[PDB]
Design a protein around this ligand. Sequence first.
Ligand SMILES: Cc1cc2nc3c(=O)[nH]c(=O)nc-3n(C[C@H](O)[C@H](O)[C@H](O)COP(=O)(O)OP(=O)(O)OC[C@H]3O[C@@H](n4cnc5c(N)ncnc54)[C@H](O)[C@@H]3O)c2cc1C
Ligand SMILES: Cc1cc2nc3c(=O)[nH]c(=O)nc-3n(C[C@H](O)[C@H](O)[C@H](O)COP(=O)(O)OP(=O)(O)OC[C@H]3O[C@@H](n4cnc5c(N)ncnc54)[C@H](O)[C@@H]3O)c2cc1C
Ligand SMILES: Nc1ccn([C@@H]2O[C@H](COP(=O)(O)OP(=O)(O)OC[C@H]3Oc4nc5nc(N)nc(O)c5nc4C(S)=C3S)[C@@H](O)[C@H]2O)c(=O)n1
Ligand code: SMO
Ligand code: SMO
Ligand code: FES
Ligand code: FES
Ligand code: FES
Ligand code: FES
Lengths: 285, 285, 162, 162, 786, 105, 52
Amino acid sequence: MKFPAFSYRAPASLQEVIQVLADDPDARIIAGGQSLLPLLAFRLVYPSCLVDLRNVSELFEISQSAGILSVGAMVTHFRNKTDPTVAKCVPILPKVLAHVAHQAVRNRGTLGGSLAHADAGAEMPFLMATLGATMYIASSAGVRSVSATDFMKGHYFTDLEAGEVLVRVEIPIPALHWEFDEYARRKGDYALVMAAAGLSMQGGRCVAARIALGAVEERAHQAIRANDFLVGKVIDESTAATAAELATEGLEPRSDIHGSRDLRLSLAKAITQRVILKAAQGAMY
Amino acid sequence: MKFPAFSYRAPASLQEVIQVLADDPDARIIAGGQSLLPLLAFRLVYPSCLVDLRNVSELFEISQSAGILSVGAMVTHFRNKTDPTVAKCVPILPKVLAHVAHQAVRNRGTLGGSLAHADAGAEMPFLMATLGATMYIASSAGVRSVSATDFMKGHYFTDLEAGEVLVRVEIPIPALHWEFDEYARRKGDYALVMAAAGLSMQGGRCVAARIALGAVEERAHQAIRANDFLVGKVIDESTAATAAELATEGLEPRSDIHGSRDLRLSLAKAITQRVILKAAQGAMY
Amino acid sequence: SQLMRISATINGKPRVFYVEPRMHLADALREVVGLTGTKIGCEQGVCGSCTILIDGAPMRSCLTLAVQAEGCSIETVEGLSQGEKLNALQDSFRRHHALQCGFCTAGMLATARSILAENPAPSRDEVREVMSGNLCRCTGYETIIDAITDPAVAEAARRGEV
Amino acid sequence: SQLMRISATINGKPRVFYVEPRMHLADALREVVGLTGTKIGCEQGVCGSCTILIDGAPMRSCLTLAVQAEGCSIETVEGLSQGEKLNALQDSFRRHHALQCGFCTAGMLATARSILAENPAPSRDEVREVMSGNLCRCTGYETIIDAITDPAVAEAARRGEV
Amino acid sequence: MMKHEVVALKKKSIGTSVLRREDTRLLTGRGRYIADLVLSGMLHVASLRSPFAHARIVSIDVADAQALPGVELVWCGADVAELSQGIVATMQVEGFQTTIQPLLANGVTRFVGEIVAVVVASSRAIAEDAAQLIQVEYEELPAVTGIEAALEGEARANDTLAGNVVSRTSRARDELAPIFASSAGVVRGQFSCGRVSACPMETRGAVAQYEWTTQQLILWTATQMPSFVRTMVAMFCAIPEHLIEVRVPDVGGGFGQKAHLHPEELLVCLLSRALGRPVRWIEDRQENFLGATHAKQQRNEMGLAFDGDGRFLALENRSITDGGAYNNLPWTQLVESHVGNAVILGVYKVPAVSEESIAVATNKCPIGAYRGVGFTAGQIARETLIDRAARQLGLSPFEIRRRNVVMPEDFPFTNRLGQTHREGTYLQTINLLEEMVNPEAFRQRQAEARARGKYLGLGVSVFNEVTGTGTRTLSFLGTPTTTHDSATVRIDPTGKVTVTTSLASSGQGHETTLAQIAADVLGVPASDVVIQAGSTKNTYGFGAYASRGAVIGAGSIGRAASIVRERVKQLAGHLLEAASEDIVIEDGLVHVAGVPAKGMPFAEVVGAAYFADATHPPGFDATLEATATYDPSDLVLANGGHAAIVEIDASTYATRVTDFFAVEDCGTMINPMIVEGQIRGGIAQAIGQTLLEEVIYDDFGQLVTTTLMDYLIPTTLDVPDIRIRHLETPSPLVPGGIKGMGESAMISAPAAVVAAVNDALAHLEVVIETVPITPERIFRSIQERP
Amino acid sequence: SDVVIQAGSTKNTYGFGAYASRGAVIGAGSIGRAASIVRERVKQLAGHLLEAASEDIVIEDGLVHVAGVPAKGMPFAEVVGAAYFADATHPPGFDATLEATATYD
Amino acid sequence: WTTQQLILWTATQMPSFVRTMVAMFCAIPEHLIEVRVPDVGGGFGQKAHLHP
Ligand SMILES: Cc1cc2nc3c(=O)[nH]c(=O)nc-3n(C[C@H](O)[C@H](O)[C@H](O)COP(=O)(O)OP(=O)(O)OC[C@H]3O[C@@H](n4cnc5c(N)ncnc54)[C@H](O)[C@@H]3O)c2cc1C
Ligand SMILES: Cc1cc2nc3c(=O)[nH]c(=O)nc-3n(C[C@H](O)[C@H](O)[C@H](O)COP(=O)(O)OP(=O)(O)OC[C@H]3O[C@@H](n4cnc5c(N)ncnc54)[C@H](O)[C@@H]3O)c2cc1C
Ligand SMILES: Nc1ccn([C@@H]2O[C@H](COP(=O)(O)OP(=O)(O)OC[C@H]3Oc4nc5nc(N)nc(O)c5nc4C(S)=C3S)[C@@H](O)[C@H]2O)c(=O)n1
Ligand code: SMO
Ligand code: SMO
Ligand code: FES
Ligand code: FES
Ligand code: FES
Ligand code: FES
């Protein structure tokens, strides 16, 4: 269970990190190491060199400007879950982070590492896409941007190309009131299904809705059918239930030792219905 | 019993050795280490740095030229006791070395180190003086020579000045026939008394004699009274006995736990008589 | 050379050790520095047996490269006891029988100190929540919760001596 | 660094060890290299217990600076046996009961090997003479003389295997 | 008493020269001695010693030493005094003065070499560096430099005592003046032996590891008495005994020196506990001469009266021991003169005796035990006087002894000093020794040596010796002490045997010989037996000393092995339908005695004992591991003789021991090869004591001999080839008839050499009664000839 | 606190180990049998010294005394010390061995 | 090899058993084998088996 051999570098600048990766195609980036080291322990990957981003200070920056929250790739789950700016701008973020692993892991894990790892059951890839965030990626050719949805293409599959570095994520401050929840064997456990609901109400009537499901399929599922159904309706138990059915119909979860396809769908429906009601509650009051 | 601290240098040239000793007054030379290290073990000396002569090749040379044997300061007792050149030029040297310590010590001890240490009980200081050898000493100013007799001034007392290096010893190929012997608790042990007898025999009659006693006093004792007495005599028991008395009269050995003055004198007389008879025997052979 | 010079403070003392990048911090502490108190139960970041404090924060040493300890202040179980006496938290573990085989104990103490540093007297529920990342196969957990919430532990924590 | 990098061959294998000039070879072999077969009984060159072979010649390691091992080929008692079997000389010591406490044995073997190298069948007197620099407080020496002059030892010596 | 039990055994391995199993690791550099031990975080101790024989310690400053990098601690006498008052040494002897030796001098030092401060540092070299930084102010006081001064001077060596006489005893006080005044003949001598050192090639050493989390202490020490050390550390350091384990690695020679409790052993334990890290103490050669123990220094003013036929009429002996500043633990100053006078009559019948033993304190390191202890001095004196008496009467040294030795017809015989002789070969030894020597030929060789200016001399020494030293022997010696020596024996399931002993080896072959004993008791190959020693975790014993290992080992292992053997016989008898008492075990076969066909292999019976419940007879105790202590029910006297031929050069006074003959009777020999090794080793040390060795203190109390350059021990050129012959008179008190002999040669061989020198110089009407006999002493003796 | 348990080495004793909830029981039985063997020898010595039958001697709170008469008692350590080092206090036929081994089932 | 002795440290619940089995399955004399058990971090029966 020992890591295979590799060299190590921790450059002081983003530009240098890019140069190292460009010069050595077999080199790989290491951020918090909470997802990469387990893979190394199993010898599932054989990097020639690990390039640490610990010394690239710009990647640790958190700032807000003109309605948008900017979070650097090396910002840990801990900082994101406790930072004042993040809390005031995007309160749904720290609430979602409460579900990510445990304290020890959140002390090293980063937003960028989580997004680049792209586990289909991870909270961040799901949340960023759902919040309509934008990722900024740097390479030898410059900096480019891509939407969070386009960034996350599948399980362990991102829009990232060889030699590229995720620098930061820009999150538009939401107008919708968001609530999140998920089903996990034990709090902290990788979720079988997760759901987020963002609502806007005019009195007791919904005027805007964004329902999304994660960990059910390889990418976040924006439940358009549900969104359109909730618009113009009073959100009560029966309505939330119907929206939940609309949000899960068409989904194709995979059966494994932790749950069959049917169980997954049943859970997806239950969790979605729950979060919708919770969102409507917070939105109105 | 552990040596005190010190730095170490083993220069590749004599001039560098001289320079180091000259630049640091507390630095001391180390050759075979068989006398210096024991002193260090007892913390009787506190050098700042030990300057090894192991890399000064010229100090290891043995050669002969115009009736004289040249032995470098770093020539080990072992080499002196087995080298062909030495054996043919000064056969008395290897016979004397058989009495010096034991095999292991002889494999490291050197002629130069023995002479510089100048133990009044050592064989080399006594022998070199007796054989009328010349020491060549190097310093920043150049090379000077001094007779073996002047070199050995007393117990742990030589003509060597601060920063000087004994380079080689030149021994005149003896015309006299030499024999040596000593009295030690066990062969190899530091002698209570040693004696050498160099004789020239024309027929069965002595024409020239050089009788010397060592370890009795702080310096070799050239028994002139005995030398003069032996000239023109047929050497037999009574004659060798009388010469032995003449050679030891006036001597003042130091009384210690290994022997009183009186014992020393009695032994010096017995050993001297023995070596004279032996030299007479070998000379006529 | 395959070894890298790493400078870090361990249990209050500046240390310098040489490690290859392929070695995780747990192994480095155990095999290079010689502090075997830190235990390894999975090397996957799940069991928490290797939990230690890095710059005051609990982290999995099996998921931290030894080389990543550069410039950090590490605290292992060996640094807890002051003099030759168990500190308040350790003594409480003993009084409440919060350990049997003792393999998970080093990690338990690390997480526990982290909790008490932020809150001297946490509720049993808060403790069970934060300690959920540390596995124990011998005790059933209850006594560990008891030990952490012991009044002597709370008092020591308030005085900053846990 | 007050430590010097010394390069020497020990028992046929090229070795590199770091030592201070103040440490003698006996201590370096024992404490730095980890070959405790070489024993120390006086540190004055008299007992012979630290006797080893340097470039084939017996020398007192307590009177040799560890730094003076540079460029030398050293043979300690650990290098004698081949393939987990005592060689002729060692086996002879055992058959003749040439050791008791065994403290002087490493040194005895070094000197004996040297003797046998020059003369495969030395006389008892020759052996007593050359071995006179190795002290033994247990045996009374007779059996060591017996062991060295054993005909099987002489035979092995002639075949260059002692 | 059950401890007296003498188990029965059939000799098979016992009596054969089995090659030593320990030799292989000891010939490959894989022996593991105290200095070879490596412990994590291990620290090193160095000592600062007193440069004065007797001085008040005005002040001590250790600030600079404590500050030197690498130094972790520096203690002076006051620091230690708070942890332990020191080594308390006493004896159940009327008038004996108890002494308490402080681990470190505190306020006053009582001998050159006493420790005044200790430094613990990262390395021994650095500890020594720091020790030289310590500043001590002394006020030299008048010291007691010898026996004369101790008895007649005003100075007192140890101020905690009342006078310098530590002990004074006289077990026999017959009126002899009229006998010496009227006897046909008289010979007298004022014999004196100088101090000597056991001088083992490996010096003393110990490493302590105290663990505060368990409160347990492990003390590794090169000792001959592990159980003793454990108990004393517990008592003198006030540490619970069960929390202490003493381990003994391979030891490079002991000879008695390592049969004492050393201040340093206690110190490392105290230091390790204080620092929370291992503390290593490995002394150098100078410290062994300065702070261990010295031995053999006694003066014996002896007189022997005899009739015209050479029959001994009386023996008078005033014995005085230079005991040093304190009593060593556990032998005390009684280790020399006191125990020596108890056996002063040796093998002879002497009707009238008057002797006194005096031990005096002097400002020197404490006198201690060294192979043969106090028996040696008197042996030298008596045998030398016996030879002198013979020459005076024109009798051979062998003949005068035949006329005074306890004869075969005499056993059992109790001499004037209460020693009862029960079984030995005294007479036969004298006769065999003479045959070996061939005096007729010697006389021829001697006469022909004069013509070459060489003085040849023959010396004879006949002895008996107390072995298997236990309670009974200690009582006889006047040093009452109850001993305890247990052994454990387990028969492993597959039929192999595991023996655990309290005996500690320092080269005498226990690892091999004890296995031979166990093998014979259980009837299995010695190769199927392993001896476990060097740990106090199990068994308890006084250790190896006083030639007791073979005896005590035979007895204890015998008893323990018998217990489990009986259980095997009971099970076998049950399966074979025969009484257990009728079952024997031989060559690994358990069968009805006399009927080999009615049996089963040992492994099969043992297998059933462990794993076949149904085969067990009713009331059976299936436990196949047992422990038992053993202590002989009476003295176990061994005997023998030695003859030495020496050649002295008339001109140089050089002395050479050209021949040595030995006759030994240690009852049944376990391993003849090992026994002869013990004899030759002892003979070499004897030559050392008599012709070369002397620890010398000058008129001011300074130790002038602290190196191997000034202290000469024998080399290959000092010891001749030795001829040995054996006689066996089995002891009925020890299994296999085994008797001891470890010290034999050092008790008697020295006498043979001294007697030889005197025989060599007899024609010059000169005698030499002081050892070592150096060229100076020979030169002086001859110069002062009449 | 005056007792220490040594385990983890096959140098002495032999057992099947800990399994099937047998430790407390097997330990109690075996240690009990072993301690009893040496306990009896202590009582035999105490009986001799106190002039009483061994079967009437009890050891409680480190005190060795006649049952019901803690007045004629001796501290445990004193009796043990005599067992080891006071040969004259031993009763006839006594086995002074204070270390024993026993199997239990 | 110089003593032919084997020391096996193993996290086992049955030391004597392991010692006897090593001797049997490896044909090594039992008296030359010592099994040592350090502190063990839980067994629950798993460490009550002889492992290859
Ligand atoms: C026991 C355990 C439980 C966990 N539970 C959960 C959970 O409940 N939910 C969850 O979401 N996660 C969970 N995680 C994973 C955690 O969130 C990881 O920290 C995260 O997935 C990876 O971030 P990282 O900073 O550790 O990155 P690393 O592991 O270092 O690596 C992430 C991957 O992205 C690459 N990479 C890193 N940074 C960049 C960058 N800026 N640009 C480009 N490529 C980059 C690396 O090369 C690697 O392939 C768990 C981890 C453990 C050990
Ligand atoms: C156990 C033992 C027994 C011995 N017995 C005897 C014996 O019987 N007879 C005998 O005579 N000797 C005896 N020796 C000593 C032996 O001969 C030493 O080797 C010799 O005295 C010193 O030579 P060395 O080459 O070892 O020099 P080192 O010990 O290195 O040093 C000797 C001294 O000379 C100085 N020095 C060395 N070389 C030079 C140079 N070229 N120029 C200037 N200064 C220099 C050093 O600085 C030092 O002060 C014995 C030694 C031992 C250990
Ligand atoms: N009948 C007998 C008697 C003895 N022996 C063997 O010879 C040995 C020594 O005999 P023994 O008289 O039983 O004495 P110990 O075993 O108790 O050994 C101690 C004894 O041993 C002597 N010899 C020594 N030899 C060595 N190598 N090292 C020491 O430290 C020695 N110390 C001395 C001193 S002092 C003493 S007291 C035994 O162990 C035994 O292996 C035998 O085979 N048969
Ligand atoms: O240890 Mo031996 O009796 S002097
Ligand atoms: O070790 Mo427990 O019997 S399953
Ligand atoms: S070993 Fe690190 S989490 Fe289990
Ligand atoms: S006490 Fe055993 S795993 Fe926790
Ligand atoms: S330790 Fe080297 S000769 Fe004695
Ligand atoms: S065998 Fe012990 S010193 Fe030689």
